[PDB]
Amino acid sequence: SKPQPIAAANWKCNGSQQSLSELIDLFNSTSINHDVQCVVASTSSHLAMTKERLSHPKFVIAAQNAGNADALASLKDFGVNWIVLGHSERRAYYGETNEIVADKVAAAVASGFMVIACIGETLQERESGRTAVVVLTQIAAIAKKLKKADWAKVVIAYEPVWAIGTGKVATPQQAQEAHALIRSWVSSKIGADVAGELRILYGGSVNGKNARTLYQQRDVNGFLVGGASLKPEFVDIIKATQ
Amino acid sequence: SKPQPIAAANWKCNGSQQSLSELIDLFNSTSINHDVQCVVASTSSHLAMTKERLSHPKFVIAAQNAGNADALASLKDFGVNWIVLGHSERRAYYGETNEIVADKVAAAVASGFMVIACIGETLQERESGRTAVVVLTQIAAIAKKLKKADWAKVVIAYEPVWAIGTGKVATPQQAQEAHALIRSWVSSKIGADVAGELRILYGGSVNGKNARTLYQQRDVNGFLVGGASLKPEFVDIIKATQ
């Protein structure tokens, strides 16, 4: 069946410390009796805080965007071994190419980290019918520096960039397509055993309502919630991974 | 002639305080001999530090969000008089509509803040010939919640969203084209006076090599440097406004 689910919260800067605070308390008070791996990603400025307050047993802490070998080392020593790389806004605003992103992922994985790699196409990419070539080009970049063994440390997060504030809305059905597309290349390129236990999270707009239908999809193994999607309702999202 | 220029650095959390600290030092050490307004906008977290380390007479701190009377009040009391609203990242990832933005802007202005409002179209919009409709719409929204007097606290920052991580590259001429369009509307919609004094900042990829050229345009009044464009060479950018 499906590998172990993953419910990750991608927190960022223009979000308050109090906001981050309240959330952590919520998570702590929450009961999770099912097999799921929760994750709280955070920028550098909050790593210390969430590290000191997050106590839920089904939760782990993760960093975002660490590339430098020294930076990695610190994280490891600081007690953080999960990292989110290749987010849409990183590629767009920080000019993080498939290459740059590939380099990072390899570094992190070498440092013994658990990586969440983000990939996705934009509106113009989809429109022009470049969806396949695009997503595949990305995944290929990454897979170019990993060994078959390294994959056990990799998590894929599909980002429907084409639906990020564009007005477009990705139906649960469309997501499945992307995920299925991704899982194929893997099974075909890396191996079946690999594609089998590989996690493919949905990094689109999710909520309490759609989280259920979304998850009932064959190739959907979790979520990467962020932006305006990140709210107390996150709790509901966790539960949906049943 | 041209109105007083503005050189705004838009700092965001994905980048340690060290990078920020280092930057402040640079800025504090720099010598600016001309009439120019420098600004360092930062996310919540580093607001305190920035305020505690920044000492250059030509600089000012700036927040990046809210309209909540409380938030504004606090900021105002904290010693922050500038604020940045409507950034592409916000409208896209945080679901900030033309109305939300317009509201915020109205709040800040009422609280006696100096506002930097971001407007700009996407690749799809431009490719679809929506450029004029879009930007004009955006600005119209802001304008409708203001009075002729409020404009003195308004600063427009044009974001070539279509040029951000798309492969496309905007030219100083394509910019002047956009800036010229914006100013025109303001001239006929609000008044020549307003239009004449109105500051319009180019908020796209810029460096030490193109800065001067960009500033050479007749409708370009400064810069809103952020993301990868945010390097120590920001100093060069300031000089390009000479």
Curated annotation (Swiss-Prot), chains A, B:
The keyword Zinc does not apply. It comes from the Eukaryota. CDD domains: TIM. Substrate binds at N10, K12. GO terms for cellular component: cytoplasm; cytosol; glycosome. Keywords: Gluconeogenesis, Glycolysis, Glycosome, Isomerase, Peroxisome. It catalyses: D-glyceraldehyde 3-phosphate = dihydroxyacetone phosphate. Pathway: Carbohydrate biosynthesis; gluconeogenesis; Carbohydrate degradation; glycolysis; D-glyceraldehyde 3-phosphate from glycerone phosphate: step 1/1. Gene3D superfamilies: Aldolase class I. Its EC number is 5.3.1.1. The active site is at H87 (electrophile), E159 (proton acceptor). GO terms for molecular function: triose-phosphate isomerase activity. Belongs to the triosephosphate isomerase family. PANTHER family: TRIOSEPHOSPHATE ISOMERASE. Homodimer. The enzyme contains a high proportion of positively-charged residues in beta-barrels V and VII (compared to the homologous regions in other triose isomerase sequences). Since 2 clusters of positive charges located at precise distances on the molecular surface are common to 4 glycosomal enzymes, it has been speculated that this might represent a signal for entry into glycosomes. This is Triosephosphate isomerase, glycosomal.
